[PDB]
Amino acid sequence: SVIAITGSASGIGAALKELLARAGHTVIGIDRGQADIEADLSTPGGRETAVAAVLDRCGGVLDGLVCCAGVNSGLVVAVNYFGVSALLDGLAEALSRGQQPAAVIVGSIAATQPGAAELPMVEAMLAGDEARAIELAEQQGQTHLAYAGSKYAVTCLARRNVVDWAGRGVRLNVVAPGVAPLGRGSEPREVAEAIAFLLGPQASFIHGSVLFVDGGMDALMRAKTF
Amino acid sequence: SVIAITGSASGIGAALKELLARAGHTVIGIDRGQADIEADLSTPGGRETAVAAVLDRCGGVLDGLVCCAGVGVTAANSGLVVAVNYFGVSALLDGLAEALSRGQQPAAVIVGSIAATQPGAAELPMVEAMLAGDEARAIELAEQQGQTHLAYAGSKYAVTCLARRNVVDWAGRGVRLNVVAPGAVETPLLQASKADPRYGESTRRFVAPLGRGSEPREVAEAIAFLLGPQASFIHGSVLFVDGGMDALMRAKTF
Numbered sequence: 001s002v003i004a005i006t007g008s009a010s011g012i013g014a015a016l017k018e019l020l021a022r023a024g025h026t027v028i029g030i031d032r033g034q035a036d037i038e039a040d041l042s043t044p045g046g047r048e049t050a051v052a053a054v055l056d057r058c059g060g061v062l063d064g065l066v067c068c069a070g071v072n073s074g075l076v077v078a079v080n081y082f083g084v085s086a087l088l089d090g091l092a093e094a095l096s097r098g099q100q101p102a103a104v105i106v107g108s109i110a111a112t113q114p115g116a117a118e119l120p121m122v123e124a125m126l127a128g129d130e131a132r133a134i135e136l137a138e139q140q141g142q143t144h145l146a147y148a149g150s151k152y153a154v155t156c157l158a159r160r161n162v163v164d165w166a167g168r169g170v171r172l173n174v175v176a177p178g179v180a181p182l183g184r185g186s187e188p189r190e191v192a193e194a195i196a197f198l199l200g201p202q203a204s205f206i207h208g209s210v211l212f213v214d215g216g217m218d219a220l221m222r223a224k225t226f
Numbered sequence: 227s228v229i230a231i232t233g234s235a236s237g238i239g240a241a242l243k244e245l246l247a248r249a250g251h252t253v254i255g256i257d258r259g260q261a262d263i264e265a266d267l268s269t270p271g272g273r274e275t276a277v278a279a280v281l282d283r284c285g286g287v288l289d290g291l292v293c294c295a296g297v298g299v300t301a302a303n304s305g306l307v308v309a310v311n312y313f314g315v316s317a318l319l320d321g322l323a324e325a326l327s328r329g330q331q332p333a334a335v336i337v338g339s340i341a342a343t344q345p346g347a348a349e350l351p352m353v354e355a356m357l358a359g360d361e362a363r364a365i366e367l368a369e370q371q372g373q374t375h376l377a378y379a380g381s382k383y384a385v386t387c388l389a390r391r392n393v394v395d396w397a398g399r400g401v402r403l404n405v406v407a408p409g410a411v412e413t414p415l416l417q418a419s420k421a422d423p424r425y426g427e428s429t430r431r432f433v434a435p436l437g438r439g440s441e442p443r444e445v446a447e448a449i450a451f452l453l454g455p456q457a458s459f460i461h462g463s464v465l466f467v468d469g470g471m472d473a474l475m476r477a478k479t480f
């Protein structure tokens with residue numbers, strides 16, 4: 001499979017890149033630097049450039065997409081929400097043309113922060129109004145609030161488009177990485193393994209799911225919420 | 227590794243038994259019949275038999291346990307639904323916890339249901355009795371509630387909560403425990419619901435976004451993943467395997 005990965009140059013994206021390469025897949029890496037495709041996903045121009053470059057590289061046909069790129073509050077909203085949505089939307093056609101195509105967004109357990117759902121930022125993001133979402137985040141003035149709000153919104157975005165993606169024949173799921181009950185934090189490779197699972201043919205009936213990979217933390221803190 | 231599977235004689239459990247066996251694992255099947263271990267998981271006595279028999283077969287060391295035995299809305303009565311879907315799971319987890327703790331990279335999976343997310347399921351009285359472990363009370367409440375679908379949703383809700391509530395105890399034993407929550411899957415259980423006078427329309431009313439039901443093997447693959455070392459940091463999670471149904475019906479819940 002030919003799989004595009006944003007944030008391929010560090011952390012989870014880099015671990016996934018390595019994992020998939022070792023497993024025999026072809027990886028198109030997209031990141032700010034040290035990548036096949038170097039682009040700034042915080043701007044519409046960077047997103048446009050990255051989408052065109054991916055399409056060129058894969059000949060308009062793509063088997064997988066993983067959005068891992070993430071990071072003032074305006075920048076947080078621009079990268080973590082709109083840098084994901086522009087890439088998903090820009091590459092949806094190419095994915096629809098691929099072989100058992102699937103995509104994964106790397107969310108965060110911060111998406112479950114109490115009150116995130118009610119942040120004005122969030123409505124603007126889900127409406128697709130970037131200028132208004134950035135303005136709202138900047139007047140809120142807390143980067144960590146923008147982080148939680150963007151992760152909440154991007155997780156909602158995945159689920160809300162479950163019908164559109166099904167219609168294209170492309171699965172779309174979220175991985176929500178996380179002391180946890182398991183007594184440690186995760187290695188980037190462990191998150192990468194969950195992503196690779198969701199991308200692959202073993203997950204052929206999994207669509208619109210949010211898979212927590214957090215050593216039990218969400219179960220401990222939100223037992224009743226599922 | 228050595229993995230016990232309740233409900234191995236049919237549907238999802240049968241698919242998983244085949245999948246694991248082909249991958250080289252030793253599978254210990256438990257079912258009403260047509261299994262290594264024949265036991266009725268709807269009574270304390272049957273569960274006791276099953277646990278003792280599993281321990282004997284694995285030498286008191288287990289690397290995997292999958293609680294897949296269950297009944298749906300065409301079961302005999304609401305009491306039976308609770309006895310099997312909740313207590314047939316919990317008693318096997320209780321009884322085999324020590325054996326699992328002794329295994330290598332051990333892990334367990336409960337097969338839940340998207341029915342767990344039915345509105346109002348959380349507030350069904352029978353749910354409290356299940357989580358308290360009071361089987362006689364849960365069965366009485368289930369019977370009084372009057373409808374197998376409520377016992378089905380209640381039992382699936384409760385057993386999912388159980389997995390999450392006990393997250394720390396399982397971590398302390400070094401054993402991961404997760405739930406798989408299927409939407410419709412093209413076994414004999416689904417066919418029975420589809421043809422039922424009372425619940426058929428309900429069952430056939432809406433299809434998942436993927437436009438089809440799951441094949442049992444697709445659910446088995448998700449279970450096998452959660453059992454294995456590539457899921458080493460996944461614990462207390464509920465993995466929906468439903469072709470988009472839950473995302474469609476509860477888009478903002480996670």
Ligand SMILES: NC(=O)C1=CN([C@@H]2O[C@H](COP(=O)(O)OP(=O)(O)OC[C@H]3O[C@@H](n4cnc5c(N)ncnc54)[C@H](O)[C@@H]3O)[C@@H](O)[C@H]2O)C=CC1
Nearest residue numbers: 233236237238257258266267268295296339410411413415
């Ligand atoms: N088929 C579906 O659409 C869905 C199924 N599920 C769950 O998946 C699990 C497996 O169901 P399926 O494979 O579809 O059904 P199935 O009927 O094909 O298999 C269930 C197996 O459990 C065994 N079992 C039932 N009661 C038992 C008892 N008292 N003692 C020992 N074994 C017993 C049965 O004999 C059967 O072999 C069940 O927990 C069910 O609730 C969840 C969502 C959807």
